[PDB]
Amino acid sequence: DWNDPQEPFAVFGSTYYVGVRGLSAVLIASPQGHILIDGGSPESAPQIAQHIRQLGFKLEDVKLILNSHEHFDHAGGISELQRLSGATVLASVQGEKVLRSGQPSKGDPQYGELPPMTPVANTRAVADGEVVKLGPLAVTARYTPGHTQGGVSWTWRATENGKSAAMVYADSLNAFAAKPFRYSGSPAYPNALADIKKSIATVAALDCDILISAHPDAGDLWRRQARQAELGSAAFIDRQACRQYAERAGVRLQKKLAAEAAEK
Ligand SMILES: [Zn+2]
Ligand SMILES: [Zn+2]
């Protein structure tokens, strides 16, 4: 279902959606080369490539591929997209380790139920708050771990027709765990609860004109895009979108902690 067809579209300025129906990917284009956020799953990668080409861009102009988090459904397509492009792949320090090996971390909240990925070469770790620069593009890494040990949300500004928008590619904030992992306390990933609560607050506080979340439905992307026909790019603007997304994650976390008590 996630990999179902989805036509690509301009979001704001040189920023495009190029993902699939249930898994985001975002192209940030420029005459000096492009930045691609995420690769979906292995099945998504050829669709993302076709979406990039369909819009009139070339894969070999993609210089950098950024990862939200190091799971099969968002990083699994990265190896193939890197093969098509020659791009360097960027991630947090923790995320980079999984991307390079393809092997789920033993501290992953979902460790045990995660498939391996094809190892990714030409990676580079980014620090929290590090700005990724490419010509007129400047994309900031905001560490938002908790869903994974290495999750990263990405922020940048896009411009068109004299207007500008604070763009937010939000990582998943969902407290989801494979047995026997517990957010209430697990020595494999001892800071998981503190991390996810801090990441929820981080995303809630972001300068957030246009939100695109790793699962697009979870940040209401299709509800907003459904108004593009009437409103143009303003359909995507909603300065409460990141706070609403973070509040929903906070509710899911409380439900997860309650479910964990019933297993204690
Ligand atoms: Zn995940
Ligand atoms: Zn996921």
Side-chain angles (χ1 to χ4, degrees):
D1 252 357
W2 288 347
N3 278 293
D4 271 338
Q6 172 64 47
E7 287 301 294
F9 47 97
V11 179
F12 201 90
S14 76
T15 290
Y16 298 78
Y17 190 91
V18 291
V20 297
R21 182 59 179 188
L23 303 166
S24 294
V26 164
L27 182 72
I28 312 176
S30 91
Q32 282 161 273
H34 322 306
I35 298 175
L36 175 71
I37 304 184
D38 270 355
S41 88
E43 275 164 305
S44 317
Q47 299 183 79
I48 290 160
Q50 286 141 15
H51 289 160
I52 292 165
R53 301 188 193 103
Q54 176 180 353
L55 292 169
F57 301 108
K58 302 173 203 171
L59 271 290
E60 304 196 321
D61 291 337
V62 177
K63 301 306 168 188
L64 306 162
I65 294 166
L66 319 181
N67 179 224
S68 62
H69 71 264
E70 58 272 33
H71 282 174
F72 189 86
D73 288 315
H74 301 279
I78 288 184
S79 147
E80 165 68 9
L81 282 159
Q82 180 192 57
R83 182 191 72 81
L84 291 170
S85 60
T88 290
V89 169
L90 302 185
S92 62
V93 175
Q94 286 301 130
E96 195 273 344
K97 287 186 284 218
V98 173
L99 298 192
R100 209 172 214 195
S101 71
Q103 299 183 31
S105 167
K106 293 191 165 202
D108 201 283
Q110 307 188 37
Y111 177 73
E113 308 194 24
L114 293 170
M117 298 177 294
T118 301
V120 172
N122 293 345
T123 61
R124 171 159 50 87
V126 300
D128 195 9
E130 178 171 340
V131 179
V132 179
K133 289 254 306 178
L134 177 63
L137 314 178
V139 184
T140 299
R142 301 295 301 269
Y143 277 23
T144 55
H147 187 75
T148 69
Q149 291 177 285
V152 177
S153 303
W154 301 93
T155 65
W156 66 109
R157 290 198 75 87
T159 59
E160 61 167 56
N161 195 23
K163 299 172 166 155
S164 73
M167 317 293 291
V168 172
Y169 191 103
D171 193 17
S172 170
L173 298 175
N174 281 6
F176 187 82
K179 300 179 244 84
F181 188 91
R182 296 167 46 91
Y183 279 85
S184 315
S186 266
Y189 178 7
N191 290 335
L193 181 57
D195 276 358
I196 201 153
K197 292 175 77 66
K198 189 191 179 215
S199 303
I200 291 172
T202 292
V203 170
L206 293 174
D207 193 5
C208 179
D209 286 318
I210 298 174
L211 163 69
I212 300 167
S213 53
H215 286 273
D217 42 301
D220 292 343
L221 186 60
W222 307 126
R223 175 181 58 72
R224 290 187 268 126
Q225 192 271 329
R227 313 192 64 194
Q228 191 181 11
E230 279 73 37
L231 300 178
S233 61
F236 297 106
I237 294 179
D238 183 340
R239 284 194 58 81
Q240 304 304 312
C242 290
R243 176 169 340 271
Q244 288 162 355
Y245 177 81
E247 281 184 43
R248 289 190 296 263
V251 171
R252 285 184 164 249
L253 170 65
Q254 291 308 296
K255 293 177 173 180
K256 180 59 180 170
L257 295 173
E260 286 187 5
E263 311 293 328
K264 183 101 174 297

